[PDB]
Design a protein around this ligand. Structure first.
Ligand SMILES: O[C@@H]1[C@@H](O)[C@H](O[C@@H]2CO[C@@H](O[C@@H]3CO[C@@H](O)[C@H](O)[C@H]3O)[C@H](O)[C@H]2O)OC[C@H]1O
Ligand SMILES: O[C@@H]1[C@@H](O)[C@H](O[C@@H]2CO[C@@H](O[C@@H]3CO[C@@H](O)[C@H](O)[C@H]3O)[C@H](O)[C@H]2O)OC[C@H]1O
Ligand SMILES: *[C@@H]1O[C@H](CO)[C@@H](O)[C@H](O)[C@H]1NC(C)=O
Ligand SMILES: *[C@@H]1O[C@H](CO)[C@@H](O)[C@H](O)[C@H]1NC(C)=O
Ligand SMILES: [Co+2]
Ligand SMILES: [Co+2]
Ligand SMILES: [Co+2]
Lengths: 434, 434
């Protein structure tokens, strides 16, 4: 796609701290951009939609190439259309925003300049942020994560994409998402099927795959940390059901691991660690700090701070594994006890290390789940299982929770706030901000 | 040996904090006891010495069993004879103390009760302490470490030892030390050879071996962190040169690894990290905090705090190893690049994990080195090597430094102070003391 300017594009600014081993931190100035899928897509020569509801224009978009030639992405009114605001080092995303139309959530990338994404090399480093999840009920996911995207959003590889990072192109993740309207500078109209339950989305004949570090997927009830390896580290197109992932016939039939080696303290047995109010170790009615450390062995370490009190990731015992570090032994034990072979099939933490050794882009989002109602995060899943099935219970939410139309109607004012992002060598981010 | 009471034994009290995963710490009350080798050893029935200078009484001690039957250990005047004082959570050890006789240094164990040692299980936990090394010049070693000693100092296994932990019996370490005057409730007079350069010590026909975690061996110039595995985890007697260790003919001819997998930031190339004054990351003229974390994989992590600024162990690159965690990959790379096979021969971190999974006793000491002048810690070693030999340079001290008689004469007022000991789950010890 190209870019149009019927609506101006002003990326909300966002600062973050880069820390060094010598003990100081210095402020960096970036901004955030909304993903292309949230944008208005129209003809280059007029205001006629190329996509509306969950249908493509059959005249403007008769095939993937003609569509990309005819169509452009336009600018975003971040606050009034999308409920996205920033203030200094803080970012807020509202759940439902009513303007001329209803918008649900957002997916945002941290930028280095108005036309390029910021890349972070996670290996050997740590990432710290503060989050307020108090206004996230069952069925919602305020997510902070990394994906192996190109810094230009794909322009250099796909010259029919001229919109680029400035317009939030080039997304990929470990679900090999096929809901993307543009992949590799083409549209995704070929093979398009509208969603049976979502007026605004569908699934096309192509998907976009890459490695994904899910640092934080959470609401006020449950939180999870999950690396997802792919056999191709960076962004790569996939074809139809060969994509695998959530929306293909076989989620395991592609190049990425859609399940991941997940660590949810509640799922692992500590049902007192994280939740709303003073009965939990971390009180999710209050802001908390989350620090994630990527040691060079490829293992991941985690600690939290709330009201000046520090807590390592809680210990878990699973099969022959015992500890609080997300390492090979944990992931192997998890597969043995909870089931599955996707993480190990895709190369486990060794393959994942190839992603964290390279550059990844920071993503912050808020979403509800039109496939599985977020039950995999915060409820019992699958819903016919009981607590006697190892790993079935992931949180205290009812198996009836998270119906998107219901939570959109009942909780439109839900929101997530991410703040005080700090990045640098392991051990450096607790030092004073500069 | 038995215990005598011509001199009373009052263990200086010492408090420390036990922290929990839930974020609080509570004070514990213990005390310290001086090792048996520093004590007066005399006939049970009189004040006649069984040992004097570096010679045993040939009449009282004609053999190991008769000696133990005839002889007892007596009490210690901690401050006036040994230069050992405590105040709350702080312990100070002076280098040379002149009373009726000259005393050099001390080795002390933390007690649980007046008759038993405190045991710590390191695996899954972390140990934090503050240290002032400002008054430790080249050639000195203020050491804080753990060894796999019996809580009773050997009494249950060796009933001819009735003095016990109360009198500092039962020492062992990864050098399989043969300088001990009593091992396994026997004397060590058989095979005794006086030291050629130390008026107060010698080497006997038996040694005492066990696993050793050298958390801290340091002065104002250099510091090292070193696990030492043994093929028998806990305390075990050894015979003559079959002991291996520093003072046997072949240091590698026994059951312990006397070299260890050492991590000295200066040796590894960072010559700016630790030293006296503002030109170093950690200024050794000032108190610093040292935290050591024993993750369940068997790897060891380390960070430091000084003036509220936190520093992970500095990164090192050695062969194919890169990082700051002391793990299998580091220890293997160290052997490949610096030389040696002792650590891996004795089972490496896997064997070492058996020690940290069990109980170990806390040791604090101050010593000078009558074998190698502490050059292995703070100078170039061996002394004919140059900086072009990988790992030869371990600190900035002259290869002429550390002659015991010289440093004892020039620096008698040297001292080390250890304080604010805190122990608990990984991530817990930075929380407020209780
Ligand atoms: O025509 C434009 C609309 O299409 C646009 O609607 C937004 C489309 O994206 C929606 O978010 C989806 C949520 O799930 C992700 O997986 C999808 O990729 C996203 O597309 C968003 O809720 C809609 O508001 O709004 C502007 C119109 O001009
Ligand atoms: O007779 C008693 C003396 O023997 C005693 O002297 C102390 C003996 O221990 C000395 O410390 C040695 C240092 O190196 C360690 O490896 C040794 O095991 C220790 O023995 C200490 O410096 C001497 O003061 O003092 C009291 C006398 O009654
Ligand atoms: C030494 O370590 C400190 C602390 O990590 C680091 O900031 C510095 O760059 C290192 N210097 C060298 C020469 O390795
Ligand atoms: C949950 O984790 C916290 C923090 O480590 C710990 O203090 C608590 O004992 C754990 N509870 C359970 C049930 O595992
Ligand atoms: Co195709
Ligand atoms: Co013997
Ligand atoms: Co580790």
């Amino acid at each position: 796609q190209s870019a149009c300017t019927l609506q101006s594009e002003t990326h909300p600014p966002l600062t973050w701290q880069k820390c060094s081993s010598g003990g100081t931190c210095t402020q960096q100035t970036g901004s955030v951009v909304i993903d292309a899928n949230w944008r208005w897509t129209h003809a280059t020569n007029s205001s006629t939609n190329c996509y509306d509801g969950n249908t493509w224009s059959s005249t403007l978009c008769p095939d993937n190439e003609t569509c990309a030639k005819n169509c452009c992405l336009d600018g975003a009114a971040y606050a009034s259309t999308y409920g996205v605001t920033t203030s200094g080092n803080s970012l807020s995303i509202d759940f439902v925003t009513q303007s001329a139309q209803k918008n649900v959530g957002a997916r945002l990338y941290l930028m280095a300049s108005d036309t390029t994404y910021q890349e972070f090399t996670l290996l050997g480093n740590e990432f710290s942020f503060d989050v307020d999840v108090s206004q996230l009920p069952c069925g919602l996911n305020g997510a902070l994560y990394f994906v192996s995207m190109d810094a230009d959003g794909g322009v250099s590889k796909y010259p029919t994409n001229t919109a680029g990072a400035k317009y939030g192109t080039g997304y990929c993740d470990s679900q090999c998402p096929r809901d993307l309207k543009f992949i590799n500078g083409q549209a995704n109209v070929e093979g398009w099927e509208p969603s049976s339950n979502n007026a605004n989305t569908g699934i096309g004949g192509h998907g976009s795959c890459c490695s994904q570090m899910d640092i934080w997927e959470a609401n006020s009830i449950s939180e999870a940390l999950t690396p997802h390896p792919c056999t191709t580290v960076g962004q790569e197109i996939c074809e139809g059901d060969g994509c695998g992932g959530t929306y293909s016939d076989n989620r395991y039939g592609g190049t990425c691991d859609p399940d991941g080696c997940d660590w949810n303290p509640y799922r692992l047995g500590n049902t007192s660690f994280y939740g709303p109010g003073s009965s939990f170790t971390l009180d999710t009615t209050k802001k908390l700090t989350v620090v994630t450390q990527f040691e060079t062995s490829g293992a991941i370490n985690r600690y939290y701070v709330q009201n000046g009190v520090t807590f390592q990731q809680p210990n878990a015992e699973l099969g022959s594994y015992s500890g609080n570090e997300l390492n090979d032994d944990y992931c192997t034990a998890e597969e043995a006890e909870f089931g599955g072979s996707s993480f190990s099939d895709k190369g486990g933490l060794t393959q994942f290390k190839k992603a964290t050794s390279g550059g990844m882009v920071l993503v912050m989002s808020l979403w509800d789940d039109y496939y599985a109602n977020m039950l995999w995060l915060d409820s019992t899943y699958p819903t016919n299982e009981t607590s006697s099935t190892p790993g079935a219970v992931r949180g205290s939410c009812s198996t009836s929770s998270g119906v998107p139309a219901q939570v959109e109607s009942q909780s439109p004012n839900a929101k997530v706030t991410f703040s005080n992002i700090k990045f640098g060598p392991i051990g450096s981010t607790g030092n004073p901000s500069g």
